[PDB]
Design a protein around this ligand. Structure first.
Ligand SMILES: O=C(O)[C@H]1CNC[C@@H](O)[C@@H]1O
Ligand SMILES: O=C(O)[C@H]1CNC[C@@H](O)[C@@H]1O
Lengths: 593, 600
């Protein structure tokens, strides 16, 4: 990379200052901003909270559904003491594409709206004065960046996003923004890997700095006492009587990285843990673990994908209530704070890159069950798609690798995988992913039903196999649910017959469920049917030895593109959007207990 | 006040650092925290978001409904650069009571859960190091502080809050927390007052500092250019062709206060203010000498999961909805809101009735129905009334000192629905109004909201008010449904009695509404349906428009909000015109159409 992905901290060597609050905001429908010098300040702005998605604040269609260029602006005072430091703007994310300006100068551009953006403003920053940042953002959708979709142009010239994915195209500055000051020679990146040796543990590490001075690495336990110390950008910390990080029983050490001439110090909490695939088993610290939990979303009323600690608190309290131990970051990397808390709460995370919508369809959720092939990986643009896919894969892994909670990388969700065009594509992604991960932890992806065991060319790439199946909803279901169970067992029997000796994890299954809709006997959208559907699925899961995980879809109701198949978003949630349990929630709780 | 109510800013002289995030948290039911040394750190904490209310996070009754002592803890790094400055911990609020500890030392205690708490940690802070904050908080209810209520003890010994008011007892650290650094000689407070002169305006000001050095005051326009400059802690800025701050058309000047020692600047404070006058003349409410008709809502700091936790996103959405209904005003029921509400109201040009938490001054754990009903509870005859008065006046001073310079704040509400039919009540509020008047440099209109028991024949407290705020529920609590025609006549009868008194003061209806289930449709209407909400409002509109001295209508409520659970509250109060998720019910359009045209 060309910047540090590390989470900002505050010490004697590093400073940070928040830019969160009310920013200036202006739509640029005619796209004349750059021509008109908006990079020096917006001419007629409104107020916009940062962090948040902008869409749900407004009361008119034009603004909520805005697609194209729009601008942010704010001012901030730089402390005079920040002089002669490397000064960076750190955006938690810019969705989807952006150009950062500071004091009139173009600093950097970024592609991908769910990972941090860093802008080196050292030479242009004015310490001891008020400074200006202006950001030009674009939220269009294409097939050359993630996530994939299309942008429709109406006859008045207004643009409209047409996703190939099933969630609303929220955008803006949805995560916290910092200005930070680093020493001229600094810790840029680090990596840990773990090995268990009886009661001892080895922490293999790697450190990348912006200079050549010696590096000291210390490991402190939860109370701050030194347990290991090494020198070098590569080495091994030896921990006697290591207190291992356990599922729903976390222990966190604090790693301390020092550049000495001290020139720089970085601290971060980590957990000693191993993850391995052996046969059909997923081994955490050598003991088989069964994944229980949900696919989630960064989604909440009014805030959109805007981060807030309160959402995290309620969501984890609910997870623990259902006795879950895992969730997948569908369908994109979350705000860094989610992983930090998962580390402390002892939750497992399948970390997913935004590789969703790689099958050309504007109502993809039902097109996944009919095998109509869209020639997606045969397009003239896929080299661009692959490059940005690998880029997002790199940024995610560099960012999240040192979290103990992250046990696997999901590198796609429901793409076309039945041709060799697809295989050659993902062969590259998997190769790249393994290169970026210091731990080489399990790599997988979520397959849709179209990827028949007889046709799929991509599952051999996976360390374990994640299936999204909706036998009971999109396939048969309702009156035909007994046929759905027969069809479901039939596909699993075919997978079993392959004798792959790899773990299978169901990463999606569910039914849209209206809070309050009761029916006796049950009907598809009712609360009772959600329960009956789950119990049928549970029966199938328990019929196969190599099934080692069940992640239900979804944790909570979330916002989608409006259409004839989405009644105010997606209602396959087990909890409502306001985080209250439907009837089927206790079914998970009793089972997972 | 022995601290600066001023909102923290960042410049060459002042520094600030946010303490928001995940704090450590622990309930203290046996109330053994201090004796066990929790002030040095909590022994077995959980994680807790700041800012937020704690109640809605948990999944069990015992924790959601917790009443008593509970603790917060966090750590923070102090820049070495802050050495030899005055360092303060600034809580937006601590609900309801608190003692702040820093690095093991007791710093300060505070009573009142809706106004800033400032704790001077200058002598205990350790620059260049990690520092520790611990807060002991209590959220019980009594009759010696605001808001009023009782604390019930269950059979198992667990405490339970029993409010005399109709909103849930959210508590904790519900607003932003800062650590800030000030110069040793600093601006502690200032006040502005305005006088209009044709096309010109005067800005009268007063400045309070912690020292004796000269003060320079500058006034900048919205483009940052100088329009006036004078020197001295008291003085007048003269503005030619003044751009007045107007309703739904705000213009904000920036005032700049400088402490100079003449070879340098010792301190600088900036704030946006609006040139505006507010006055009562006869039955008219005059903004910039123009009679204005108040249109809007009573609100609540209330949102799913967050409780009363502040968030800019809530503010943005709520103001977009307000502008959509063509409102120009809202009341901060029943407590001062987070400061950011006022800042944005200044920018959006909304009028604000700023209300102190003097709610629940009638002993009843079912107060919303105990109204209209004529039961006297001897509330102001208790031996605790002197102590209640002290904290009431204390909250008033803090509120007024904090919000006085906001152009949006046009009036102070000093109570909501107390007992007012005895001289005990009169003597009580006479003190409050007197105190309130001394604290306000502008001496703007002062009022309170009267409930129906405060009959025109019996009420002793309305003469204290510059204008009169009435909460009435004719066609809900009184003769609702089939009897709505009887409701209208009863309403006209009371207004006729008020009219007959020839008081020559403005009357403002600060509450009226019906509980309304989103989705409940009925033809013909029934109470609780969306259609009835519409019909109820229109009967009320007819009565409102029948009296010239009626100069404002604030519907109750802007949005559905959380209350104590009971047989009359279906998941809180549903008199909202919007849902709790901020989406409009059918009656929202009714206001939009009326307020679009309704003026004067
Ligand atoms: O249809 C559904 O509910 C799901 C199907 N597969 C992908 C998800 O994003 C989508 O939301
Ligand atoms: O009954 C009601 O809905 C209202 C009556 N007057 C006071 C409010 O706090 C209360 O919520």
């Amino acid at each position: 990379l060309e910047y540090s992905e590390l989470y900002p901290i505050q010490n004697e060597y590093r400073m940070m200052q928040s830019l969160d609050g009310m920013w200036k905001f202006q739509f640029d429908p005619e796209e004349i901003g750059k021509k008109s010098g908006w990079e020096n300040g917006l001419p007629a702005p409104v107020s916009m909270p940062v962090p948040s998605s902008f869409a749900d604040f407004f009361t008119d269609h034009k603004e909520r559904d805005y697609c194209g260029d729009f601008w942010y602006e704010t001012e901030f005072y730089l402390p005079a003491e920040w002089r002669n430091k490397k000064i960076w703007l750190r955006f938690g994310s810019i969705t989807h594409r952006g150009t950062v300006y500071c004091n009139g100068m173009e600093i950097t551009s970024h592609e991908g709206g769910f990972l941090p953006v860093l802008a080196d403003i050292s030479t242009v920053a004015k310490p001891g004065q008020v400074n200006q940042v202006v950001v030009k953002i674009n939220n269009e959708l294409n097939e050359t960046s993630l996530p994939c979709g299309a942008t429709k142009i109406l006859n008045n010239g207004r643009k409209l996003a047409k996703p190939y994915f099933d969630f609303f195209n929220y955008s803006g500055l949805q995560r916290s923004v910092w200005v930070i000051a680093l020493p001229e020679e600094s810790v840029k990146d680090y990596s840990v890997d773990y090995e268990l040796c009886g009661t001892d543990a080895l922490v293999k590490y790697e450190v990348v700095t912006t200079g050549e001075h010696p590096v000291i690495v210390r490991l402190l336990d939860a109370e701050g006492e030194l347990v290991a110390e090494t020198e070098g950008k590569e080495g091994i910390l030896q921990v006697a009587n290591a207190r291992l990080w356990e599922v729903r029983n976390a222990y966190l050490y604090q790693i301390v990285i020092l550049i000495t001439d001290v020139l720089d110090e970085y601290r971060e909490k980590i957990g000693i843990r191993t993850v391995r695939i052996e046969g059909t088993k997923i081994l955490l610290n050598d003991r088989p673990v069964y994944l229980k939990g949900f696919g989630k979303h960064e989604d909440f009323p009014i805030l959109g994908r805007g981060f807030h600690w309160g959402i995290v608190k309620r969501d984890f309290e609910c997870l623990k209530w259902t006795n879950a131990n895992c969730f997948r970051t569908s369908h994109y990397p979350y705000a860094e704070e989610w992983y930090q808390f998962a580390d402390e709460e002892g939750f497992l995370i399948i970390d997913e890159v935004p590789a969703v919508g790689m099958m050309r369809s504007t109502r993809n959720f039902v097109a996944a069950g009919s095998g109509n092939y869209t020639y997606f990986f045969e397009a003239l643009t896929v080299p661009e798609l692959l490059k940005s896919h690998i880029a997002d894969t790199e940024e995610m892994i560099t960012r999240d690798k040192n979290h103990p909670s992250v046990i696997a990388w999901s590198l796609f969700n429901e793409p076309e995988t039945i041709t060799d065009y697809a295989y050659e594509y993902f062969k590259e992604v998997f190769a790249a992913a393994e290169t970026y991960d210091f731990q080489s932890r399990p790599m997988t992806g979520a397959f849709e039903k179209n990827s028949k065991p007889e046709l799929c060319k991509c599952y051999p790439l996976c360390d374990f196999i994640c299936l999204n199946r909706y036998y009971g909803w999109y396939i048969s279901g309702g009156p035909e649910i007994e046929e759905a169970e027969e069809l479901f067992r039939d596909e699993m029997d075919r997978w079993k017959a392959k004798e792959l000796n790899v773990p299978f994890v169901f990463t999606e299954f569910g039914t849209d469920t209206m809070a309050g809709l009761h029916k006796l006997p049950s009907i598809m959208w009712s609360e009772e049917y959600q329960k009956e559907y789950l119990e049928m699925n549970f029966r199938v899961f328990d019929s196969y030895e190599f099934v080692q995980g069940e992640l239900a879809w979804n944790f909570a109701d979330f916002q989608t593109t409006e259409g004839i198949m989405r009644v105010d978003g997606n209602h396959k949630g087990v909890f409502t959007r306001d985080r209250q349990p439907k009837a089927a929630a206790v079914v998970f709780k009793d089972r997972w207990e």
